[PDB]
Each structure stands twice: as C-alpha cells, then as structure tokens.
Structure 1
Amino acid sequence: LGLREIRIHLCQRSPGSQGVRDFIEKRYVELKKANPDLPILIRECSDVQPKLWARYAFGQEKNVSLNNFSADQVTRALENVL
C-alpha cells in the first residue's frame, strides 16, 4: 500500500540539518496542502542525526538520512519516498 506517516528528526547545529531547516522554513506548505492525509511529524531535541523516516505498509519504518545534504536533494529523497 501507500505512504502513511513521515518522520523528520532535526537539531540546531549540523549543515545537513541546516539544509532541512531551510526546507522546513520554506517548503512545508505544499506537502500538507497537497496531502492532508499525512501527519508528517517534526522533531527537535538538542542534537540528533537529521533523519527522514516513513512508517507505512503493515509496520515498515523505512530509513534514510539527511546528513550533509542540500535541500533540493532532501526534497528529491522526499519525493523518492513519496
């Protein structure tokens, strides 16, 4: 089946996290606007690997990282998942 939930994990000091900060400060509205049926959760604690996860299809947590990636490649991997 299709995608159900998307998990984003970020921090305050990492360049890949800085790119995903620029993604989440510029281009969040198109995802939830186009897809209201995806509660894409965002997480901030202090310092963690900037991870992009997807929970769907009978209990599958699929796992990519957004360590030291540019924001267009981040959106590329996001569309690769979705």
Structure 2
Amino acid sequence: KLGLREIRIHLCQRSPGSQGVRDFIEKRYVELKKANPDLPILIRECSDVQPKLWARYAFGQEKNVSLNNFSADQVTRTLENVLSGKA
C-alpha cells in the first residue's frame, strides 16, 4: 500500500554543495523521467539551500535524505534506492 507518490529534489544554483545534484539533473534526470513518466519528480532550486531529496509515500508519509556535498553518482544511488525499495 505504501508505494511512492512523488519525489522532491531541492538544491541551489551556485552553492558548491549542490553541485553533484546539479550534475545529476544535467546528465541523468531526463533518463529518470523517461523511465518514470508518471512519477512527480519536482526539482525546486532556491538560493543558499542545502540539497535535499524528499520522497512522499502513500497517506502523506514523507522522508528526506540530505544530499549536501553528494557526487552525481551518490545522488544517482540515492534516487535508485528510493525508487526501488532499499533506501
């Protein structure tokens, strides 16, 4: 029942800590969307924001991992685990 409803990716345009997620969105987000066409992947950038991934599951349950100073490979692993169980 507790399937995944949506994910929110928060980041910053200039801060060096959001650079891995910026690279991930640049090179991997389009494939993630082609593989998950109905999943809301809401990418919201805001200045001086620590990178954070949100996952909203069934019945309003959300959990956020922190993506600060993540490499693009680490954000890819973090989204893979979220989107496929393990987390």
Q: Given the two structures, how large is their TM-score scaled by the length of structure 2?
A: 0.86
Contact 1:16 1:70 survives alignment (8 Å): no
1:79 aligns to what SS in structure 2? helix
* Cα RMSD, aligned residues only: 1.1
1:25 aligns to what SS in structure 2? helix
The reply to whether residue 14 of structure 1 matches residue 6 of structure 2 is no
Cα deviation 1:20-45 (Å, max 9, x = unaligned): 11100111111111111111101112
Percent identical = 99
Gaps of at least 5 residues in structure 1 are none
Greater shift, 7-16 or 66-75, is seen at 7-16
Equivalent residue pairs, number: 82
The structural deviation recorded for 1:54 is 0.6
Q: Given the two structures, how large is their TM-score scaled by the length of structure 1?
A: 0.91
Q: Matched residues in 2 for 1:31 and 1:69: separation?
A: 18
Gaps of at least 5 residues in structure 2 are none
Aligned position for 1:26: 27
Contact 2:17 2:50 survives alignment (8 Å): no
